[PDB]
Design a protein around this ligand. Structure first.
Ligand SMILES: [Cl-]
Ligand SMILES: [Cl-]
Ligand SMILES: [Cl-]
Ligand SMILES: [Cl-]
Lengths: 424, 424
């Protein structure tokens, strides 16, 4: 009776091939993941955005600071609690107390609901948890309403002798729910307490293309394990160095790389009988200053950019802050909830899939199967577990689709784990 | 709408005191358990039978070979699967294949359903699992119907060069779902593969009173942690040596110990305003030959036993096989499902509570609140999780009652873990 998203494409052969390979190799796959986690560990928590194109199933974002805990299905709270307990035992085994640092947002009601939901899980895992703000406008204990009969209490972090403290509260470890993409503040540097994840100065200006290389390496091992075309799991990408988007010196360089990537995508689209237009996501990385993103369908789309596009791709008015441009094969999503495009987000704690939700696009044009939704979505909670495949059933039965989602999400998790280890 | 058991007693003060202590110490308790598991580990799986008397909440049986997996709530399968994966990672991390040895029962339909349910969990955890019989009447692959549209395949174990094998199947480890209480067969001794749990020759004739001593030691530490009378969690007990139940030489010895135990129980019943009659469970342990059990309400009940009682307490017709007699304070259960007495069974994998079920007595007399049900019960699956306390709620709200059940079950698990380590 509960309506769920369905694919609006009949071209699903590659997805079903992937599902068949996973369901014919299920114990081999799970044994392989266990070998990987013995070598690498896993983060405390994470979320991975996927897109199901019917001809491809690929991760498109990995977040080590997930902010949608309030969107999880409450029937799965016990599974989350148990996984959070495992994470505590691996990452901070002796912890009694945990300081949670949120994003600096105090006016997003949904973000505050996430904080409440996350805090609840961590308390049920047996930790004493308090919320320590690093927002400069929080100067005293501040109660913020979630507009649902509850509130959260934000307290300003105080640094004393290489430790962060709150009123009568000295934690063992510090959990970041703030991605620090603007740079690790000096107040969080050189502390005695461990940060989770353990970020160090340099984090925010790291070479972000290493994320895509790390996922390539994971897929290069996994794809032959199950005998699948690695392209079914992995978008192509390329990079170039920093460019000045207020000049045209870098124009031909960029255009040539767009053309070459589009050509690679076209070869695969021909192989698999795909009729949609190839597209490329152009990501201008300006480190602490942010990132500018645009999508293109031809090399001409990066030539002679207009004023607004130049400003977007430069990221800020300060000159030449872009240090790398990443070009990635765009992946379609053909999942729809009635007229709305939907795309899934898979949640993990330690190396276990705990659930997730769909982002159901609020916009409604012909190109919502291409456009990234950003903040323009409403969540729709998952109805099916990801850890209960039916190996003899239909390959695209719901539990088998969700098993496949959980496999690709765990590949992306492993890649992020490897990447983070290699920043030291 | 789903009917559940309710207490038929208004004398619940001690239960509510326990619940209040647990809910005022929840993070301290969970931190304490984590410290314990770091030192001791936990078994692969276990079940613990509890009785809620309103004036006491105590474990009355610990089983390291649980046989009621088919009675678990299917909505909690993902939680079981995840816990089973943790158990695999701690106890047999590199295992690809697992040989499961069942009880020698081939005609109990419910036991075969347990085997199917257990096998399903282990396969979902990513193991290749086969069922290896050590029953002498299984001499070829044998399909047994569960009378529910399914069957299980039993294959005779073959020993070759210090390993157990089946057709094209050599496992890494061996999971016992057979308690080997009749003695570890020679075919299972001196193997290269690990047994789970890791039993050694001598197991079946161990000193069974060490189980009660180990639980005493756990409660002696836990009770002061939360400031509770340890008697609220722990039945009194005593022991004597082997006795000849076909003679009366041991009669006065036994009678005196019954009298002394009853007197201790009476003191506590007076303290707490309990009006029910104290009772004692007399357990005659004959090692591999089995155990004889009777309940008594006075020292006179062990004097001048009749023929049937003498035979029961001697256990077998072979002479003087009883090596120890354990006397335990009997604990009432006042939970009822309408007219039927009910008592809970809590399931764990690794150190995590995964669910459980009530044993709903099929018999209907005035003394079913005292009598152990044995096989005379129908299962009723738990509706409430054990890991989701509401610390500010009513102490006997359902999630808080079940949190308390999961705490006492984990104390009994820890005790069994310590006991088993100390057999080596
Ligand atoms: Cl720690
Ligand atoms: Cl930084
Ligand atoms: Cl192993
Ligand atoms: Cl033995």
């Amino acid at each position: 009776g509960m309506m769920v998203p369905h694919l609006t494409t009949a071209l699903t052969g590659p997805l079903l091939t992937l599902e068949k390979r996973l369901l014919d190799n299920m114990p081999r796959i799970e044994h392989w993941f266990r070998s990987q986690w013995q070598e690498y560990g896993a983060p405390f928590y994470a979320s991975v955005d996927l897109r199901n194109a019917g001809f491809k199933l690929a991760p498109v974002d990995t977040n080590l600071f997930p902010g949608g805990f309030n969107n999880l299905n409450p029937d799965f709270l016990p599974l989350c609690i148990q996984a959070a307990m495992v994470a505590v035992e691996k990452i901070c085994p002796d912890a009694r107390r945990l300081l949670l640092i949120p994003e600096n947002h105090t006016r997003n009601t949904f973000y505050l609901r996430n904080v409440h939901a996350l805090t609840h899980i961590l308390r049920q895992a047996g930790l004493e948890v308090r919320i320590g703000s690093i927002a400069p406008e929080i100067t005293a204990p501040t109660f913020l309403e979630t507009h649902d009969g509850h509130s959260i209490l934000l307290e300003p972090v105080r640094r004393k002798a290489n430790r962060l403290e709150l009123d009568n509260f000295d934690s063992c470890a510090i959990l970041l729910n703030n991605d620090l993409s603007g740079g690790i503040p000096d107040i969080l540097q050189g502390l005695e307490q461990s940060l989770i994840p353990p970020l160090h100065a340099g984090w925010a200006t790291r070479r972000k293309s290493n994320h895509f290389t790390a996922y390539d390496r994971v897929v290069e091992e996994f794809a032959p394990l199950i005998d699948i075309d690695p392209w079914l799991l992995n978008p192509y990408f390329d990079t170039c160095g920093g460019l000045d988007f207020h000049a045209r010196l870098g124009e031909e360089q960029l255009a040539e790389k767009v053309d070459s990537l589009l050509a690679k995508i076209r070869r695969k689209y021909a192989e698999y009988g795909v009729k949609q237009e190839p597209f490329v996501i152009v990501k201008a990385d300006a480190g602490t200053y942010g990132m500018g993103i645009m999508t293109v369908k031809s090399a001409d789309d990066v030539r002679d950019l207009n004023r607004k596009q130049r400003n977007k791709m430069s990221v800020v008015k300060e000159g030449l802050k872009v240090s790398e441009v990443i070009l990635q094969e765009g992946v379609y999503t053909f999942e729809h909830l009635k007229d709305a495009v939907a795309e899934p987000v898979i949640y993990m704690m330690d190396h276990f899939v705990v659930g997730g939700f769909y982002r159901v696009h609020t916009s409604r044009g012909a190109d919502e199967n291409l456009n990234a939704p950003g903040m323009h979505f409403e969540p729709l909670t998952f109805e099916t577990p990801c850890s209960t495949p039916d190996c003899a059933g239909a390959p695209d039965a719901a539990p088998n689709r969700f098993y496949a989602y959980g496999v690709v999400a765990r590949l992306a998790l492993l890649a992020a784990t490897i990447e983070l280890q290699e920043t030291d």
